[PDB]
Amino acid sequence: SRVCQVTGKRPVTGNNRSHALNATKRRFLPNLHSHRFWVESEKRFVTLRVSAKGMRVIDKKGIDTVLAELRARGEKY
Amino acid sequence: MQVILLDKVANLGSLGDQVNVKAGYARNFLVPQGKAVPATKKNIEFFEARRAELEAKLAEVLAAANARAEKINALETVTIASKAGDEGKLFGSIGTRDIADAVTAAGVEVAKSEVRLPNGVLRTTGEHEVSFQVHSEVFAKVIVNVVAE
RNA sequence: GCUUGACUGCGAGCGUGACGGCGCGAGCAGGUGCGAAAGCAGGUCAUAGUGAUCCGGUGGUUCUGAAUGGAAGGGCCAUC
RNA sequence: UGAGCCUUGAUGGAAGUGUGGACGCCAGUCUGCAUGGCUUUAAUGUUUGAUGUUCUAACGUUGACCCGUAAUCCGGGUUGCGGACAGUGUCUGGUGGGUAGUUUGACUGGGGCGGUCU
RNA sequence: GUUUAUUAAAAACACAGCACUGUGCAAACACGAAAGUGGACGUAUACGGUGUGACGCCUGCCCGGUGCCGGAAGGUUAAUU
RNA sequence: UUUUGUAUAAUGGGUCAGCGACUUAUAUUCUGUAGCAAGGUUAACCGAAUAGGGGAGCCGAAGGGAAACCGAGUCUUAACUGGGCGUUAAGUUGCAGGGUAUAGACCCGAAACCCGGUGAUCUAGCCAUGGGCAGGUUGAAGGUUGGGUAACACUAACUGGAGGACCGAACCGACUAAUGUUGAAAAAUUAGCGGAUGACUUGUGGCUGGGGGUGAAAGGCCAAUCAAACCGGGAGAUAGCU
RNA sequence: AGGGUGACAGCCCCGUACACAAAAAUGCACAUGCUGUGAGCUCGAUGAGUAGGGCGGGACACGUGGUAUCCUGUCUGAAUA
RNA sequence: UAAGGUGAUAUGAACCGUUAUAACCGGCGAUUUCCGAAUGGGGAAACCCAGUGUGUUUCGACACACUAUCAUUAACUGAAUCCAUAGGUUAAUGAGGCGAACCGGGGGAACUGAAACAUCUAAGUACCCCGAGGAAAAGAAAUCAACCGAGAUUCCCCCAG
Ligand SMILES: [Mg+2]
Ligand SMILES: [Mg+2]
Ligand SMILES: [Mg+2]
Ligand SMILES: [Mg+2]
Ligand SMILES: [Mg+2]
Ligand SMILES: [Mg+2]
Ligand SMILES: [Mg+2]
Ligand SMILES: [Mg+2]
Ligand SMILES: [Mg+2]
Ligand SMILES: [Mg+2]
Ligand SMILES: [Mg+2]
Ligand SMILES: [Mg+2]
Ligand SMILES: [Mg+2]
Ligand SMILES: [Mg+2]
Ligand SMILES: [Mg+2]
Ligand SMILES: [Mg+2]
Ligand SMILES: [Mg+2]
Ligand SMILES: [Mg+2]
Ligand SMILES: [Mg+2]
Ligand SMILES: [Mg+2]
Ligand SMILES: [Mg+2]
Ligand SMILES: [Mg+2]
Numbered sequence: 001s002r003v004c005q006v007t008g009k010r011p012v013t014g015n016n017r018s019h020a021l022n023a024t025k026r027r028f029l030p031n032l033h034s035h036r037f038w039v040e041s042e043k044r045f046v047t048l049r050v051s052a053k054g055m056r057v058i059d060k061k062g063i064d065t066v067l068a069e070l071r072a073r074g075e076k077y
Numbered sequence: 078m079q080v081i082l083l084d085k086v087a088n089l090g091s092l093g094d095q096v097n098v099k100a101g102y103a104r105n106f107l108v109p110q111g112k113a114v115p116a117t118k119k120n121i122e123f124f125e126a127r128r129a130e131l132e133a134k135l136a137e138v139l140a141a142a143n144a145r146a147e148k149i150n151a152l153e154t155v156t157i158a159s160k161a162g163d164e165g166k167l168f169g170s171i172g173t174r175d176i177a178d179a180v181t182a183a184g185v186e187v188a189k190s191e192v193r194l195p196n197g198v199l200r201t202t203g204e205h206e207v208s209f210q211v212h213s214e215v216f217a218k219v220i221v222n223v224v225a226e
Numbered sequence: 227g228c229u230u231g232a233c234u235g236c237g238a239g240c241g242u243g244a245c246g247g248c249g250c251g252a253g254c255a256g257g258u259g260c261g262a263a264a265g266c267a268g269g270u271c272a273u274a275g276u277g278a279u280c281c282g283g284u285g286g287u288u289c290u291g292a293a294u295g296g297a298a299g300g301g302c303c304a305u306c
Numbered sequence: 307u308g309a310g311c312c313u314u315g316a317u318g319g320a321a322g323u324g325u326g327g328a329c330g331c332c333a334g335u336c337u338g339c340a341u342g343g344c345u346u347u348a349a350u351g352u353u354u355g356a357u358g359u360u361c362u363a364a365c366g367u368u369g370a371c372c373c374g375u376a377a378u379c380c381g382g383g384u385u386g387c388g389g390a391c392a393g394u395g396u397c398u399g400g401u402g403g404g405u406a407g408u409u410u411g412a413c414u415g416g417g418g419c420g421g422u423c424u
Numbered sequence: 425g426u427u428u429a430u431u432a433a434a435a436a437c438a439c440a441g442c443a444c445u446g447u448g449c450a451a452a453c454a455c456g457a458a459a460g461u462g463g464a465c466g467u468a469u470a471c472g473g474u475g476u477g478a479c480g481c482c483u484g485c486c487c488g489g490u491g492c493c494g495g496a497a498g499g500u501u502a503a504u505u
Numbered sequence: 506u507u508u509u510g511u512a513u514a515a516u517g518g519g520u521c522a523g524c525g526a527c528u529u530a531u532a533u534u535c536u537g538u539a540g541c542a543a544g545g546u547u548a549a550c551c552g553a554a555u556a557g558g559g560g561a562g563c564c565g566a567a568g569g570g571a572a573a574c575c576g577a578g579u580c581u582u583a584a585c586u587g588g589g590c591g592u593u594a595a596g597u598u599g600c601a602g603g604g605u606a607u608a609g610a611c612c613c614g615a616a617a618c619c620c621g622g623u624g625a626u627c628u629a630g631c632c633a634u635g636g637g638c639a640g641g642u643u644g645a646a647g648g649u650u651g652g653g654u655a656a657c658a659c660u661a662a663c664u665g666g667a668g669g670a671c672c673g674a675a676c677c678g679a680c681u682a683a684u685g686u687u688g689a690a691a692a693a694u695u696a697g698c699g700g701a702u703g704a705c706u707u708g709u710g711g712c713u714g715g716g717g718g719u720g721a722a723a724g725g726c727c728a729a730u731c732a733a734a735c736c737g738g739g740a741g742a743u744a745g746c747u
Numbered sequence: 748a749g750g751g752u753g754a755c756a757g758c759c760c761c762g763u764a765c766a767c768a769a770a771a772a773u774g775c776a777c778a779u780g781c782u783g784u785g786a787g788c789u790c791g792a793u794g795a796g797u798a799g800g801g802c803g804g805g806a807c808a809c810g811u812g813g814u815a816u817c818c819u820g821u822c823u824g825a826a827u828a
Numbered sequence: 829u830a831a832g833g834u835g836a837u838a839u840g841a842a843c844c845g846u847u848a849u850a851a852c853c854g855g856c857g858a859u860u861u862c863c864g865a866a867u868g869g870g871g872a873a874a875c876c877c878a879g880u881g882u883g884u885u886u887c888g889a890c891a892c893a894c895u896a897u898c899a900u901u902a903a904c905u906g907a908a909u910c911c912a913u914a915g916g917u918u919a920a921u922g923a924g925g926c927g928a929a930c931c932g933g934g935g936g937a938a939c940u941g942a943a944a945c946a947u948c949u950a951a952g953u954a955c956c957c958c959g960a961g962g963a964a965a966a967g968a969a970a971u972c973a974a975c976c977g978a979g980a981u982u983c984c985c986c987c988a989g
Contacts, residue, residue, distance in 0.1 A: 002458085007796095012820055013935070014804040021810075021947050025936080027457090028804075028820035031395045036364070038109035044913075045382090052395075053796080053822070059078070059104060059115070060796060074899095101390085106363045235582060255584070276424080289572050293974045298813050301571055368450050373908035374915060379460105381915105383908060396821040397802060398503040405716095408945060425669075425704060428723040429628080430692055433680080438721035439669105439704085503802085532989100549985040562986055619938035620955050739954045742939045771855050798970105810948075 004030055005075065006066060007054035030054075039063045048077055078103045080113035081120060093128070095121065142212030145191065149209045150218035155179075157205065159223035167200030167223060176207035176221045187211070193219070 003010050009030045016024035031051040038045050041064055050058065058066045071077050080103055081095040089096055095116055098107060107113040114120055126133070157175050160168035173192035180186065191211030198205060202223035209217030 009820080010934095012805080012818095014820080017804070023947090026804085029395060029457095030820065033365080033394070037104075040109070042913090056100075056823095057796060059100060062115070062117070101364075104364090110363080235584095236586100237588070254587075255582090289570105289574095300813100375907100378465105382913095399501075411944105425700095426721045428725060430729090432723095433699105436723095617939090620936090622956105739938080743941100745943075769855095773855100 002029070002032065003049070004032065004051040004054045005049050005077075006058060006070065007051065009051055009054055037063050039067065046077065079116040080107060081116060082107075083112050083114065086112050142191075142209075143215045145209040145211055145219075146215045146217040149185075149187075149191070149211075152180075152219065155220045156222040156224055158225050159200070159202070159205075161202075161223075161225040162200055165201070167202075168225070171205070171221070171223060172197055173207065176205060176219060177209075179221065191217070191219070198223075 001010075011027050011029040013025065013027045016022070016026050018024065031054070032049045033051070033055075034047060034049040035055065036045060036047050037058065046063075046067075067077065078098050078100045079095050080098065082090040082092060084090055084092055086107070089098065090112070098113075103113060103115075108115075155176075157171050157179050158169070159171035162168045173194050174189040176194070177189040177192045178187050187209075188211070191209035193206060193208035193210060193216065198207075200223070205221035205223060207221055208219045211217070
């Protein structure tokens with residue numbers, strides 16, 4: 001699917017709009033890098049496709065506070 | 078990313094100490110392993126007195142060695158037999174070990190550490206002012222006198 | 227020789243254009259210059275020497291300015 | 307190794323007798339290692355960028371095992387290798403008939419050529 | 425040998441041979457938004473692309489222009505600050 | 506019909522019958538007409554529904570200036586002159602018609618463009634698995650022996666049987682001529698012709714999809730279609746032309 | 748009203764206004780039973796990778812324009828009645 | 829409900845009813861082959877092959893029934909690795925696929941008009957795709973106003989071409 005998984009950040013669509021204002025359909029893909037996360041509490045080195053910034057959240061909230069929803073949200077993981 | 082160090086952590090770690098760092102260092106090493114932890118308030122606030130548990134909880138409660146300066150000082154006439162030695166010298170060896178537990182009958186037992194005698198007290202009879210060394214700062218007022226039989 | 231009329235505001239009424247425009251103009255008002263004065267001067271003896279609009283630039287202005295005071299911006303005049 | 311900030315030097319506890327540097331009105335010398343009675347540049351910390359090193363712990367492995375599993379996929383683990391490189395996302399200079407949409411004037415003794423266009 | 429089924433069978437294409445050029449393997453390159461796959465269960469005596477076209481004798485001079493290769497010290501130069 | 510001009514040998518019509526083209530909506534402006542008149546009229550909606558209510562609002566009774574502003578004046582200007590535009594204009598709301606605007610805008614008609622699907626039962630490659638090739642000829646490499654040599658070369662018989670080899674049916678192809686050309690046939694028939702153990706030919710099924718495939722390269726082939734297939738849609742594309 | 752009956756019918760026929768009709772099955776208003784919901788009051792608390800921001804785009808009638816406001820892919824990042 | 833009936837081309841035959849369920853009409857059920865999401869596996873749809881059980885049986889087995897996948901949950905199992913997960917089994921529920929328009933969302937043309945054509949227009953239209961209900965969406969101000977105030981959203985007419 002190519003989603004942020006943690007922020008659901010999917011690839012949006014826009015226009016290149018180069019010089020001369022020439023319109024050209026495109027799309028803005030997120031970041032994602034599938035990071036190795038150590039929940040520790042669960043003693044499991046869980047992994048999942050995240051995305052920069054959207055990953056800065058996993059740190060500000062907590063691998064747990066994050067997985068809080070996610071899993072609860074139904075997301076596999 | 079600040080997090081609280083949990084050990085050596087080279088040029089920054091100080092144990093139970095929190096300092097700045099990089100997210101690349103944390104959530105990749107400083108943490109996943111056992112060397113830090115996020116500074117989400119609780120990590121500090123829920124531990125504000127954690128350091129006071131000793132610098133307070135375990136600091137003022139300690140006054141046993143101190144109370145000696147007054148208690149081990151309120152003794153009535155302190156003197157220890159040092160066995161005379163023909164008007165002058167002595168026969169026995171009265172120094173620290175003695176003026177640091179000469180109270181066995183009173184049950185007020187102690188150690189030979191609490192003593193006030195830099196050097197061995199020559200075999201004389203002078204006012205053996207061997208206070209309690211048990212406490213550093215506030216020592217005590219323990220004496221004794223060279224006696225004999 | 228002396229000067230700056232190659233001035234500013236307007237203009238009876240005409241010529242020429244499909245139109246946008248282009249041209250001629252006595253006289254009026256303010257101030258100028260030449261002449262004793264009558265007067266002449268609103269560029270060159272005349273007919274070529276040139277680009278609409280838009281979009282912006284520059285100086286001016288108490289015209290406007292989205293709650294009010296300002297300001298950006300807009301208009302008006304000059305001009306690129 | 308430049309960039310700066312902090313602190314410490316040179317302009318603006320007693321001589322005299324060996325031995326460094328710092329440019330030079332040199333008719334200069336100033337400043338350091340044995341003996342004798344607040345502007346310009348330099349170090350240390352320091353934070354910041356730049357080269358280039360080594361490390362592992364992200365990240366890669368289409369090396370070797372193990373388990374799912376009587377599976378040359380996939381997933382988790384062990385180890386080896388590589389390593390903040392590679393790669394990807396946003397932005398950004400170049401290149402880009404590979405692809406795409408279009409333009410490429412009128413007069414004219416037919417059209418073109420030539421010439422013309424106020 | 426092949427070719428315009430249905431006006432062209434040829435002097436056209438292909439060919440064996442030749443030369444240049446790329447590619448060290450997760451190859452170059454190609455299909456694909458990706459995963460994956462062909463190349464190849466191959467590995468430079470190999471694979472792709474280009475031009476020439478058995479074989480014999482040969483294959484001269486020009487690097488100014490265009491392109492490709494190598495250098496990049498210096499001039500100019502993007503986002504960024 | 507189209508033309509400067511047609512009996513024109515310039516277009517269209519074999520004939521008949523039925524069908525076949527300036528409409529419709531909202532707006533705007535005129536003209537006729539009706540109502541009311543410095544006033545005219547409501548919209549939605551309510552509704553004892555074509556009534557009645559509702560005057561939100563629209564137009565008109567004042568214009569000038571770029572405007573602030575001013576006002577039968579107002580701008581222009583220092584101008585308190587002149588000049589421009591205004592002031593001694595009846596408007597408004599229905600109804601019918603003329604014209605315009607927006608829409609398919611009288612009707613019919615492209616060659617194309619874009620989107621989503623259907624097609625490799627024809628054909629082009631390729632994949633897997635089966636089949637076919639009467640007869641006749643040529644005689645390579647290798648070899649056994651005789652000779653030959655220091656030994657090898659070398660050589661001669663016989664043996665052996667190669668080859669995008671030779672002749673020629675089936676089979677595959679398509680060089681020539683005739684005939685056919687409203688055919689027997691939307692590419693054939695007849696007489697010749699080329700390849701015929703190979704880059705051969707063929708059955709069965711499979712994979713490549715449209716700006717894509719495939720191609721021993723002709724723009725050839727991709728279902729009698731190809732300089733971008735076919736079907737449905739955008740769509741009544743647009744058509745200063747007929 | 749309308750329809751039929753051997754030509755056009757209020758009175759031939761079926762209907763027609765009108766008046767009534769449901770074992771059952773359900774739409775929906777209410778009405779209440781059970782399960783779930785939890786009112787009500789006192790004292791609280793009052794929505795952070797968020798608002799803003801830089802870069803690329805998109806939405807607003809508004810084509811970056813002097814251009815607010817809204818969403819953002821990408822990098823950041825606050826006050827806290 | 830009622831004297832007529834066995835739908836039609838369809839007569840005929842053979843019949844059922846003339847008071848009270850003959851036929852016919854509406855309610856509610858019983859049955860309901862095979863294909864088809866198609867669901868036991870497979871497959872050129874309407875056919876082919878299996879497992880485990882049974883009503884039975886003369887007990888050959890005749891058929892019939894249950895067995896897809898995923899999600900949540902519960903129980904029982906249970907690897908690399910002590911634990912622990914992953915994986916597995918079972919049961920329970922729920923989904924699955926049809927659909928005319930309307931609606932929310934994801935992606936999104938060109939012809940065309942500009943008398944050419946890029947910006948611009950056609951148009952967020954055609955079209956494809958996911959989802960939902962009888963409505964969907966939206967909705968109780970970090971909204972407007974303008975120093976007076978109004979008071980969520982939605983639809984209508986004005987504002988105004
Ligand atoms: Mg002249
Ligand atoms: Mg082109
Ligand atoms: Mg076009
Ligand atoms: Mg011409
Ligand atoms: Mg030949
Ligand atoms: Mg031909
Ligand atoms: Mg031929
Ligand atoms: Mg050639
Ligand atoms: Mg040649
Ligand atoms: Mg040559
Ligand atoms: Mg003619
Ligand atoms: Mg004729
Ligand atoms: Mg007729
Ligand atoms: Mg042959
Ligand atoms: Mg032959
Ligand atoms: Mg023949
Ligand atoms: Mg075939
Ligand atoms: Mg064809
Ligand atoms: Mg259209
Ligand atoms: Mg089945
Ligand atoms: Mg099935
Ligand atoms: Mg056009």
